[PDB]
């Protein structure tokens, strides 16, 4: 009956299953999706994850028992096979199933690569698990277009995550901005009120530009905005949006930022994972890895957990970082990001090629009773010591 037909369809279209992170990251794929590509997507998720948690400051799921305790990713062979299964929007995330859908494609079928679209949808999984309480489409953050620019603009933004250089702008998004008429560039206020009902969806790109403008030029506002969402503080979020929307000088800065982004189009890259993740790194004793990381990052109270994946094992090293006297959450955030990236580049300078697989982030800003900056710090990497 109808049971055999749904399962037969999934077998025909998605015969392959690839399992990572002790069963919590599952790629269901067509038989023409290469295993090299599967591996790239796994390490891409960790790059996006690391930058997301740095910005949000939380890595604990907001709810207990939700479907996205297991992330499933269904990657069809081609645009045609994706369409039949539902039309072509590139990809889609469904939070109550913890699942997103997209497809492999050639350069002749899309300007966007599979890894770019994957990075976008993975950001929606991160938003929905770690930042936006309740379910997508429900509650006050899903009235009045409150989060429409944010959900889609920060998903385009974090799709540009790198390993050791933070979040970088993406060439194809800048190309959309650059190709637009100057006269038609959205105001800050227009972008913050855009919705899925608009005449076109250029808000994805102007929404990206708001996120990137705040990231580079006003991280205090980005941090406060993320904290209001995290805390389901509608009043604080609305105060921030109104202050951004009503300040002409803020729009001037955002317009200037759009133009600087356009000027970067020619020389911009496409952040995708390095081939260095795919190398055969070889054995390195686990204790040496953990000790070298803890020393380079100046981490105390360190714990580690090991996970099994289809093609390798990984480790997640958690520690506390207590630095110097705090210069405020916002100045601290900037310093912490620079120190952490500098550590990642040092550990990869020379040594085990496995150090080129490391991603790192920090969360849960606080200060001690002596007013020292304090962060929970997290490293993730390949583990070749069974
Ligand atoms: C059901 C549910 O939980 N959704 C959900 C949850 C959390 C965050 C966002 C979510 O969906 C947002 C969305 C976006 N579209 C429009 C259709 N798709 C697209 O246009 C793509 C384009 C992108 C690949 C460039 C998209 O933007 N892909 O994402 N419809 N819901
Ligand atoms: Ca949610
Ligand atoms: Zn999206």
XYZ file of N, CA and C and ligand atoms in Angstrom, residues 89 91-96 117 120-121 124 127 136 152 156 196 201 204, ligand 1:
85
model
N 13.276 26.268 -5.324
C 13.768 27.349 -4.487
C 15.199 27.105 -4.024
N 16.597 25.097 -1.915
C 16.683 24.306 -0.694
C 15.643 24.764 0.314
N 15.420 23.938 1.326
C 14.414 24.260 2.324
C 14.722 23.517 3.610
N 14.508 24.186 4.739
C 14.630 23.569 6.056
C 13.242 23.465 6.695
N 12.965 22.351 7.370
C 11.700 22.137 8.057
C 12.068 21.810 9.506
N 11.963 22.801 10.396
C 12.379 22.604 11.787
C 11.676 21.448 12.498
N 10.348 21.256 12.395
C 9.702 20.160 13.135
C 10.125 18.786 12.654
N 24.705 26.317 -0.825
C 23.311 26.139 -0.421
C 23.208 25.338 0.864
N 23.885 27.571 3.679
C 22.730 28.415 3.973
C 21.709 27.691 4.818
N 21.306 26.490 4.379
C 20.277 25.748 5.105
C 20.764 25.303 6.478
N 20.066 27.908 8.948
C 18.711 27.872 9.482
C 18.563 26.806 10.582
N 20.058 28.517 13.653
C 19.147 29.529 14.171
C 18.043 28.910 15.004
N 9.673 27.870 14.051
C 9.550 28.830 12.957
C 8.081 28.963 12.558
N 16.958 35.178 6.711
C 17.548 34.903 5.417
C 18.863 35.642 5.189
N 22.519 33.854 4.568
C 23.501 34.196 3.531
C 24.866 34.628 4.102
N 8.463 37.831 2.790
C 8.436 36.860 1.710
C 7.390 37.225 0.664
N 12.891 39.025 -4.129
C 13.514 38.608 -2.888
C 14.935 39.133 -2.810
N 17.038 39.203 0.468
C 18.081 38.282 0.935
C 19.433 38.961 0.892
C 9.393 25.294 7.771
C 10.499 25.873 8.585
O 10.755 25.461 9.711
N 11.251 26.796 7.945
C 12.390 27.448 8.478
C 12.864 27.258 9.781
C 13.912 28.028 10.263
C 14.480 29.009 9.472
C 14.024 29.216 8.179
C 13.000 28.415 7.672
O 12.500 28.507 6.396
C 12.580 29.793 5.818
C 11.967 29.787 4.464
C 12.446 30.250 3.262
N 11.473 29.980 2.385
C 11.378 30.345 0.961
C 11.780 29.189 0.048
N 13.208 28.882 0.080
C 14.131 29.614 -0.554
O 13.841 30.510 -1.326
C 15.557 29.304 -0.209
C 16.545 30.203 -0.975
C 18.021 30.078 -0.573
C 18.541 28.657 -0.867
C 18.885 31.066 -1.435
C 15.794 29.476 1.254
O 15.762 30.572 1.821
N 16.128 28.353 1.860
O 16.194 28.340 3.244
N 10.429 29.356 2.969
N 10.750 29.260 4.244
